[PDB]
């Protein structure tokens, strides 16, 4: 009978942007409601609860979230997205007078504010003998995106932002490797639409 | 800590009984374990009131628990399945639910322990022509070669642990995706100002911690034991 909905499994956000995260609860009786947070390796933490007192409730970093019976609602917002943020956020709901119940989780990714992308794809040697080496496609803004390889002895990862507090930089990359012979970073992200201006050395 | 969890991480083959512990220090009545999956958040295994009260879960098949103490709180996979490789946690509650959260089990099930394996750990050396264009050099670090999908990634500049400038892949990829034991591979990136890759002082290590073998498991190949161990790889600092 009692059940807490949260759609969409991943979820994107522009960084400086008001963050939204929704929930809902199928409850008869109104039920305690709960937003919890996790980070990478790490354990569940509390933002905010719902426990009929105020219906507008606050929680830490400037999180808040309001119960609206009436649309059975009780979605997570803060003001602005910052790089922080990223982690994955779990709505809670009380159930049967005994336990609390999970949904199934968002995850947050907020996404760099690029003001000058500078596209490029770079060819990195082991640092030990090798004929052995990686391509890194980098510096792209946020209308990138990487796609799967199309060749089942090419290795390409999924896109991460790297945040560099010593220059408060961030940036977008993507890396690919193939133990073949004919390999080129010319060639690796072949199966994705990168931008028209993408720097490859020589 | 007022709950805590045994053991904090644990291989084993399938077909072994395995048993995790939760223990409190408020003697809170209400004690749970949970499991957490990719894409379905925490699911509720089994929960117990009080000494010898146990009340099932949505998901209590395979597993079995028992309330020992007021203190603790056993949780056991009766003849473990590659389908029980999760992160476990307990949790107490008060009477209003203030829950308390242990900080987790990682528990991976493996059907063969022959297939174990550490990574191999290379470090990449930044491109000249990204030093040119930006200014910048990105170091990466790839592990290949490891089974299971069970380590963790950090690097390490003059000896010390870096977060700033590190993106690493939040899951490793299958090596060959059409294989249920497939190896895995994982990369992670450090980027530092192009002067501080340019100081040949400078020492840059990726550490993965690789989680394996016991000492207390049967080894039978002329390969090194796969054995829970750190494999590294460093790079220094270099002019142009």
């Given at each position: ?202 | ?30 004690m749970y374990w949970y499991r957490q999956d990719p894409g379905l958040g925490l699911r ?148 530092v100002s192009a002067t501080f890759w340019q100081n040949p002082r400078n020492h840059f ?36």
């Amino acid at each position: 009978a009692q059940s807490v909905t949260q759609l969409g499994s991943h979820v994107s956000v522009s960084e400086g942007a008001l963050v939204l995260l929704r929930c809902n609860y199928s409850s008869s009786v109104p039920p305690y409601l709960f937003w919890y947070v996790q980070y990478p390796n790490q354990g569940l933490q509390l933002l905010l609860k719902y426990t009929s007192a105020a219906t507008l409730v606050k929680g830490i970093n400037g999180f808040e979230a309001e119960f609206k019976k009436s649309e059975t609602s009780f979605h997570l917002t803060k003001p602005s997205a910052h790089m922080s943020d990223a982690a994955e956020y779990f709505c809670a709901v009380s159930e049967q007078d005994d336990k609390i119940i999970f949904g199934k989780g968002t995850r947050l990714h907020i996404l760099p504010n690029i003001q000058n992308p500078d596209p490029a794809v770079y060819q990195l040697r082991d640092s030990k003998s090798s004929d052995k080496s990686v391509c890194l496609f980098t510096d792209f803004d946020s209308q990138t995106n990487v796609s799967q390889s199309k060749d089942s002895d090419v290795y390409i990862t999924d896109k991460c932002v790297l945040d560099m507090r010593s220059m408060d930089f961030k940036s977008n990359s993507a890396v690919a490797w193939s133990n073949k012979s004919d390999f080129a970073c010319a060639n690796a992200f072949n199966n994705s639409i990168i931008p028209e201006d993408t720097f490859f050395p020589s | 800590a007022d709950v805590t969890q045994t053991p904090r991480n644990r291989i084993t083959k399938t077909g072994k009984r395995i048993m995790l512990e939760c223990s409190q220090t408020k003697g809170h009545d209400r004690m749970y374990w949970y499991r957490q999956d990719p894409g379905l958040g925490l699911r509720l295994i089994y929960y117990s009131f009080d000494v010898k009260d146990i009340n099932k879960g949505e998901i209590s098949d395979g597993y079995s628990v028992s309330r020992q103490a007021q203190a603790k709180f056993s949780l056991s996979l009766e003849s473990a399945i590659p389908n029980q490789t999760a992160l476990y946690f307990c949790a107490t509650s008060d009477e209003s639910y203030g829950y308390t959260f242990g900080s987790g089990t990682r528990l991976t099930v493996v059907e063969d322990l022959n297939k174990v394996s550490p990574p191999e750990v290379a470090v990449f050396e930044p491109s000249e022509a990204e030093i040119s264009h930006t200014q910048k050099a990105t170091l990466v670090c790839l592990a290949t070669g490891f089974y299971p999908d069970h380590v963790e990634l950090s690097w390490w500049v003059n000896g010390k642990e870096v977060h700033s400038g590190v993106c690493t892949d939040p899951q490793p990829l299958k090596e060959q995706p059409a294989l249920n034991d497939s190896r895995y591979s994982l990369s992670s990136r450090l980027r530092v100002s192009a002067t501080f890759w340019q100081n040949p002082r400078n020492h840059f290590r990726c550490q993965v911690q690789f989680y394996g073998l016991s000492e207390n498991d049967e080894w039978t190949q002329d390969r090194a034991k796969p054995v829970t161990q750190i494999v590294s790889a460093e790079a220094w600092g270099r002019a142009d």
